[PDB]
Specification:
Layout (H helix, E strand, L loop, with lengths): L10 H11 L7 H11 L3 H20 L6
The structure holds a DNA duplex (13 and 13 nucleotides).
Subcellular location: Nucleus
Subunit structure: Interacts with Bin1; in vitro and yeast cells. Interacts with bin3.
Protein name: Homeotic protein bicoid
DNA sequence: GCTCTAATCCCCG
DNA sequence: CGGGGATTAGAGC
């Protein structure tokens, strides 16, 4: 990683990220360009957030597995 | 340095 | 090409 954490989030980036996510729950170039302009963050951080969001979701649900 | 955890390097499909 | 499993490495305490 030659220079990780070239960015640091806040509640305002999570507020954008989540509200433009709702309109396209998977990334593409257009989803990623549009969020990059609005958050005022690189297109690489948008990917890295969508990825981190799925991991946080499915981690917390696996810790709450059930059975029948 | 431990801790927080978003970011990093290889794989899945 | 992004999801993403498992681990690395910078921001904060």
């Amino acid at each position: 990683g030659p220079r990780r954490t070239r960015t640091t989030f806040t509640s305002s980036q999570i507020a954008e990220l989540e509200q433009h996510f709702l309109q396209g729950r998977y990334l593409t170039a257009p989803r990623l360009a549009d969020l990059s302009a609005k958050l005022a963050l690189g297109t690489a951080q948008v990917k890295i957030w969508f990825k981190n969001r799925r991991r946080r979701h499915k981690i917390q649900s696996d810790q709450h597995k059930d059975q029948s």
